[PDB]
Design a protein around this ligand. Structure first.
Ligand SMILES: CCn1cc([C@]2(c3cccc(-c4cncnc4)c3)N=C(N)N(C)C2=O)cn1
Length: 369
């Protein structure tokens, strides 16, 4: 049924991708953020200025209360709510219904986004980082256990007066070959909590940043559909921008732009893409001394707002390969074989001079924290 899953994601630029889901009986429709960077199925369950609809447990005849609260403070914001289980389906995903854990958010701070058009989050990472603890089975774990859907899903994020709308596909239970060209290269999932991986080398315009590879994964590297930007450890970030500033020297910008909080504009197809360099991330291969590179264009790391924001930013929590990396590629979260596959996406955005690429192997003769 993969055909019926194609284009089942939507979103606004910089505000995440969501898939339609129903919870409860009768089905309550909600748009839910696909988030490989968290592990809770958490849905607005009380009025909020940014929510135009929300999950109403009392309207559901199949809701069961777990009589347990959950409080999820985090760096940027916070949500808090009540644990229960209910029946869940994805209308444009696998044709099944599962009983899953649901965090019904009763209060939250800076969690929902104005105009994003989603009402909850589908944390697709592992139990290890779930709240309140790893005993709360994540949605995908329940789905696999209760149905026969293979332990694998794949994301094809396609990107783009009003924020640009983005489209994409979440294929659960398999690999849709029409979604990518060329070969799928796999990098090991180093540990099952976040989707943690290892970056062994990075180049800006073919030039090695030449760092001890531990800096690339300090203190970890993760694949996160719930983060817009490519986020880099401080020391790598600074080296990245310096290298990027040099490659686009002709024509200058204010460091408010480089700090990713200040847009820059051209007008109608005048954008000097060729000025900015490609960025290659080399991920560890399944074979010890091998790696492969994913190369991403400026079209990915300059996010549209013809105005663009610099979608590479600093991190104190390690490297985050967010949406702007994923948008060049078809990304397979092969949980069954503890690996993540990358292929050129059938939908990636590129000129007649450059193209996002996935290429290997590269042999590199210790990179993890
Ligand atoms: C554990 C608390 N939590 C944080 C998240 C978030 C989260 C929460 C709310 C909104 C968004 C978000 C996603 N796309 C674009 N704009 C915002 C992300 N998911 C990820 N991966 N990141 C880094 C988060 O901040 C989920 N739960």
């Amino acid at each position: 049924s993969f055909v019926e899953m194609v284009d089942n994601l939507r979103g606004k630029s910089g505000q995440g991708y969501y898939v339609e889901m129903t919870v409860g009986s009768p089905p309550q429709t909600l748009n839910i953020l696909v988030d490989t960077g968290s592990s809770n199925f958490a849905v607005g369950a009380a009025p909020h200025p940014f929510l135009h609809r929300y999950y109403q447990r009392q309207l559901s005849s199949t809701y069961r209360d777990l009589r347990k609260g959950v409080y999820v403070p985090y760096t940027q914001g916070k949500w808090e709510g009540e644990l229960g289980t209910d029946l869940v389906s994805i209308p444009h995903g696998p044709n099944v219904t599962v009983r899953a854990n649901i965090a019904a958010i009763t209060e939250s701070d800076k969690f929902f986004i104005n105009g994003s058009n989603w009402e909850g989050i589908l944390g697709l990472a592992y139990a290890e980082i779930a709240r309140p603890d790893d005993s709360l089975e994540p949605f995908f774990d329940s789905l696999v256990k209760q149905t026969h859907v293979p332990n694998l899903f794949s994301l094809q994020l396609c990107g783009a007066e009003v924020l640009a709308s983005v489209g994409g596909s979440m294929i659960i239970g398999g690999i849709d070959h029409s979604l990518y060209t060329g070969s799928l290269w796999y990098t090991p999932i180093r540990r099952e909590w976040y989707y943690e991986v290892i970056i062994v080398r990075v180049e800006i315009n073919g030039q090695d940043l030449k760092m001890d590879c531990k800096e690339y994964n300090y203190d970890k590297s993760i694949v996160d559909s719930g983060t817009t930007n490519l986020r880099l450890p401080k020391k790598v970030f600074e080296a990245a921008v310096k290298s990027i500033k040099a490659a686009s020297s002709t024509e200058k910008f204010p460091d408010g732009f480089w700090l990713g909080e200040q847009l820059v504009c051209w007008q109608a197809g005048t954008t000097p893409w060729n000025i900015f360099p490609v960025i290659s991330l080399y991920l560890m291969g399944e074979v010890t001394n091998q790696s492969f590179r994913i190369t991403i264009l400026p079209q990915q790391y300059l996010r549209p707002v013809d105005c663009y924001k610099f979608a590479i930013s600093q991190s104190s929590t390690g490297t985050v390969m967010g949406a702007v990396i994923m948008e060049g590629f078809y990304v397979v979260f092969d949980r069954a074989r503890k690996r993540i596959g990358f292929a050129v996406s059938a939908c990636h955005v590129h000129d007649e001079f450059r193209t996002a690429a996935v290429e290997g192997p590269f042999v590199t003769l210790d990179c993890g924290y």
